[PDB]
Amino acid sequence: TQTTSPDILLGPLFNDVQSAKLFPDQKTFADAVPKSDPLMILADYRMQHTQSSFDLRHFVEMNFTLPAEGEKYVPPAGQSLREHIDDLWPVLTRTTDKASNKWDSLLPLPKPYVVPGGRFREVYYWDSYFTMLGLAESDHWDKISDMVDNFAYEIDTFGHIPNGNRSYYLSRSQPPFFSMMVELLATHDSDALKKYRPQMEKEYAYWMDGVDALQPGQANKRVVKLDDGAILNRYWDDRDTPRPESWLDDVNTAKSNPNRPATEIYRDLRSAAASGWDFSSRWMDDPQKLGTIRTTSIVPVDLNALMFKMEKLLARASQESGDAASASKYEALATARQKAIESHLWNDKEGWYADYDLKSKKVRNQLTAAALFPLYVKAAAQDRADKVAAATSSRLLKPGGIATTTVNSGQQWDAPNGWAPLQWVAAEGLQNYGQEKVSMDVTWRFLKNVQHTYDREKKLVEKYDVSTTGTGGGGGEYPLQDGFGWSNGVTLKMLDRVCPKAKPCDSVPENQ
Ligand SMILES: OCC1=C[C@H](N[C@H]2C[C@H](CO)[C@@H](O)[C@H](O)[C@H]2O)[C@H](O)[C@@H](O)[C@@H]1O
Incomplete structure (x- = not known):
């Protein structure tokens, strides 16, 4: 390794x-x-x-x-959307079996895994949850168990799940879905939550590292304590150098703002990569200048919704293991987290959840799809979930799915792009609070985008343009990629939802 x-x-x-x-x-x-x-x-x-x-x-x-030139995979002609997805999982499955050089950046893992596709030739953290949703839908439980085994191995070996299994990803993690991966596996292997509790607890310790030494107003690595004593997490990369995989981009971004210390720009670029939203106006003081990115001074509402779910699942895993003390401890942590979300990540003037600004010590105003995350993890109060549903229908719901932001910056986690994981988080969170009409609107519009793009381009892609249907998205430092892990996974879950369970469809229906 x-x-x-x-x-x-x-x-x-x-x-x-x-x-x-x-x-x-x-x-x-x-x-x-x-x-x-x-x-x-x-x-x-x-x-x-x-x-x-x-x-x-x-x-x-x-x-x-050098990496393979990507001599394109060619499927048999005439496959339906569902056929195409179902038969593409082997195309996206990889292993570290290859005769491992000592200096390979690819980190060995015990089991095979599903990669996102294209230039993404390694297993990614949060992508894999949504990929697992599709694998579970199509009854590939061994692939799911194997990837959970890989992630548990990474926690035991490195202390956390790296962004991907690459040496240059070791300095950071990604949106923490591991506990939700174990919960998904537990629907099939009923003991999975008890089995993987040790690694779940180790991952929690990584995110909370140094919380006990914090005074109000202080931060350490991935955890902050606000002026009122509230404890919340942030995205954070342990290094402050250019990203090796985007070396020249980051050097040039630092050179575009020479009045700012390059190490601070690099830290905030890397930590945006840790957020999964690399990159977005969400992190930037000026949406046209990447050199103004300041990720580590922002408390993200999606991350802290996921931390709440992790604390809840740790309590469930402890309760199932007969460990009342740990179950009580984690339930109390979840309760405090929920209060901290409602008190610091809610914008009452606008009526939606939002990030918290560590510099101004105020909840921010910008609406992004991350506002759906407290609904997704069931931390939100009903009245606030209803207001988020109204903000979603009136500001974020576009012809081709739910928009990521309302700012067309030229970055990829921004308008006009729609991302499969955010479509799923939105649809599920809305459904969790009885907002079934908006939930189905998101589902139907994204499925129509996926189906029309598949009809015209014969593939699924990394992100979609939601201003219309039928076109992939763009922006950022690299071209639109094909495959694509979480697009395929979310599509299967949604396609099952729009046709009767007894007569499933293999293409998105014409109407509804
Ligand atoms: O699909 C894999 C990923 C690629 C994208 N980010 C990767 C590409 C970046 C290099 O272009 C890399 O720095 C980042 O850490 C990686 O996670 C995307 O923004 C992520 O949400 C996603 O997990």
Whole structure:
């Protein structure tokens, strides 16, 4: 298991390859596997670099195994949407079985896993929950059990679930869905919550690391204590360097705001990656300037909704294990979390849940799809859930699904993009509070987007443009990717919902 990230292993050669844009994707060289000791490669590089007619591209090809060019998968013709999804899971399944070089950035895992697709050649944390939803729908429980085993292994090995199983992802996590993954598995293997309680508790300790030493108004890593003593979590990456997989992007973003310390920009870029919303006006002081991103001074409402669910599931796992003391402890933590959400992440002037600003010490005004998360995890009061439903129908519901924000910044977690996980969180949260009409509106409009895109493009994609139906989304630092893990998973769950359980549909119906 290579723990040293490529930027450190390969020093100036890494900076050279990335700054030269040898490859159109910065992630490509981050995933390049050295054919020999980096000490040798750097020595050979230092000596061969001076030679006239030295070709950096040839040196890289000589000394590195590069990621597969992605010679496109071709399915049999004529498959329906459901057929296409059902038969695509093997295409997205990968293992670390390959003869593992000591310096491979891909971290070994015990079991096979499902990747999102395209350039995403590793297992991702929050993607996998929504992928598991689709695997469960289509009766692939061994694949689900295997991925839960992988995530438990990562918790035991690294202390937390990394963004993905890459050395350059070890410094951060992602939206914490592991407890909800175990809950999903428990619907099939009734002992799963008891079985994985130790890793669930270890992950909780990672998020809460240092909470006991905090005074009001202080923060440590992923946890904050507000001026009134309320305890909440934030996204946080342990490093303050450029992301190796986006090296040149982050260097240039830092150079675009030279009056700000680059380490602070890098920390907030990395922590936005930890949020899953890389990137969004949600984190930015100026939605047109990524150099104004300030993720670590924002208390995210979605993260703290997920922390509430984790505390509730830890109490359930403890209660099922016959551990009354732990069950009581975690129930009390969940109760305090719910109060902290209602007291600090509710915008009463606007009538929706929102992030909390650590600088101004106030709930923020911006409406994003994260406002649905307290409904999703059943922390919201009914009257506030009703107001969020009204804000959703009136501001976020678009022809092709629920919008991510109302700000078209050019970043990908923003208008006009709709993301499968947010469609599911919205539909479920609305359903949890009896808002069945808006819930079905989100479901139907996103399914129509997925079906029309599949009819026209013969694929599912990473995100969708919700201003119409039939087109994938865009924005941000890399092109729209195909596959695609959570799009496929959410689509299966929603497709089952719009046709009778006894006569399922394989395409989204024409009407309703
Ligand atoms: O589908 C995988 C992911 C890719 C996207 N982010 C990845 C790509 C970024 C490089 O372009 C990487 O820095 C980030 O950590 C990764 O999680 C997306 O925004 C995430 O929500 C998602 O989990």
